[PDB]
């Protein structure tokens, strides 16, 4: 009953059955330099970054190749743009890169301690600076003769007023890397998903860690290192994600919502190639769809990141797989995949045949599901009001199970929306439940038929 057709998979075929030698267990990270500025706008670049075979890619010195004014993202520029703006903090324990230990260094462990708290930007800038000066002093002695760290994470540069010049700068990027782009699936959500279709800022000190994960719904990520320190990246191909999740299960940590730092020897032991690379100031990281990754600051630095949704079959297939898998696991999918697919088909011409067949299949199933739901409600005497979508109306979600609710909305009262199960199970016969329809069969049917492959 999936929104996906297994026959249509464009996932690269990889055999783990054969033993793999060590050199391939440490693959080189695709690094790319940009002599011209139009290279960055070349299609071959986009073809490269989004190739399924290429889990992750570094674009070297792009912030100078287009003359991006990163300086603005400097901590100093930030503190005065707004210092009493606020910031999530992670309190962590500082460690060497490829390692994470119990309290004593007897053992390497998967669970990564990462406690939470809040400050302002100006406040964390104090800390980041003091921290640096301190490390300086302990070196201006030797000359003449557990570390607890705090990481400023997921800082929201969403307010396009306040952060005007900073955001304006990123317009200079090739379209597929931009925050907002007609060719960006995430631009077709119709509302703001903080950190995905808005920019997040990271203020790091050395040892500052972002633990193992895949992006929300397997969406591409674009990260720029502002400077002046470096970052170290580790990454695995989507293919191997369930094997990694299995480790999380054994070590008693939740794969999708838990804090975990992988044990590299485990992954080598399991025949899983790990990409290892350094990201220098002005280097852009492109994380392809579904790539497991984790990240350590080696110096003092800020990064900027957001999620992009290029219109490829791979990206799409993986967004849907994660969408369904999320709900199997009772985990909120923050990109409302069904509402997005309809928005896309109705607003964007698609020339790529494989991507076209995938969206078309999904819309079909969405229609059958709406059709089935309607009959049985009718069949059981339930009246369904018609509700219009208004302009810039968001997607909906079950107040209870967090699943996306599409087209047919169950409502109670100051009004709440539910999926059917959550409505029934809270009223046997749906008494005191209003039921709304947002798209009549014919609206969806016509939209569907209007949707054809562009040559």
């Amino acid at each position: 009953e999936s929104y996906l057709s297994p026959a249509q998979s464009v996932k690269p075929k990889i055999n783990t059955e054969e033993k793999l030698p060590r050199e391939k267990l440490n693959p080189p990270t695709p690094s790319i330099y940009l002599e011209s500025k139009r290279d960055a706008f070349s299609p071959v670049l986009l073809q490269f970054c989004t190739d399924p075979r290429n889990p992750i890619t570094v674009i070297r010195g792009l912030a100078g190749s287009l003359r991006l004014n990163l300086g603005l993202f400097s901590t100093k520029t930030l503190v005065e743009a707004s210092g009493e703006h606020t910031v999530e903090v992670r309190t962590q324990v500082q460690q060497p890169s490829d390692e994470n230990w119990d309290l004593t260094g007897t053992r390497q462990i998967w669970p990564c301690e990462s406690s939470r708290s809040h400050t302002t930007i100006a406040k964390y800038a104090q800390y980041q600076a003091s921290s640096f000066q301190e490390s300086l002093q302990e070196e201006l002695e030797v000359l003449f003769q557990h570390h607890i760290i705090k990481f400023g994470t997921n800082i929201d540069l969403s307010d396009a007023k306040r952060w005007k010049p900073q955001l304006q700068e990123l317009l200079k990027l090739p379209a597929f890397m931009r925050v907002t782009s007609t060719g960006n699936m995430l631009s077709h959500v119709g509302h703001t998903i903080l950190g995905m279709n808005t920019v997040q800022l990271y203020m790091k000190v050395p040892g500052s860690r972002t633990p193992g994960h895949q992006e929300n719904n397997n969406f591409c990520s674009v990260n720029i290192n502002i400077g002046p320190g470096d970052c170290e990246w580790f990454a695995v191909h989507e293919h191997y994600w369930e094997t990694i999740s299995a480790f999380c299960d054994r070590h008693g940590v939740d794969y999708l919502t838990g804090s975990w730092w992988p044990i590299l020897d485990d992954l080598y032991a399991s025949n899983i190639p790990v990409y290892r690379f350094v990201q220098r100031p002005g280097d852009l990281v492109w994380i392809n769809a579904g790539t497991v990754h984790w990240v350590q600051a080696t110096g003092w630095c800020n990064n900027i990141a957001w999620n992009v949704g290029p219109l490829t079959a791979y990206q799409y297939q993986l967004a849907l797989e994660r969408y369904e898998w999320n709900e199997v696991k009772n985990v909120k999918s923050i990109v409302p995949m069904i509402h997005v697919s309809w928005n896309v088909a109705r607003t964007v011409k698609i020339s790529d045949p494989d991507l076209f067949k995938m969206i078309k299949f999904c819309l079909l199933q969405s229609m059958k599901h709406c059709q089935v739901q309607r009959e049985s409600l009718v069949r059981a005497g339930k009246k369904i009001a018609y509700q219009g979508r208004v302009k810039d109306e968001p997607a909906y979600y079950c107040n209870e199970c967090d699943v996306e609710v599409f087209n047919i909305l169950f409502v109670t009262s100051t009004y709440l929306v539910h999926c059917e199960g959550c409505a029934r199970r809270r009223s046997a016969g749906l008494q005191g439940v209003v039921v709304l329809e947002q798209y009549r069969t014919e609206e969806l049917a016509q939209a569907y038929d209007a949707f054809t492959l562009a040559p």
Binding site: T91, S114, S115, N154, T192, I193, I334
Partner: peptide, 11 residues
């Protein structure tokens, strides 16, 4: 709010 963030362990 749908929003991207870091996993957590304390606080």
């Amino acid at each position: 709010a749908a929003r991207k963030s870091a996993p957590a362990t304390g606080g």
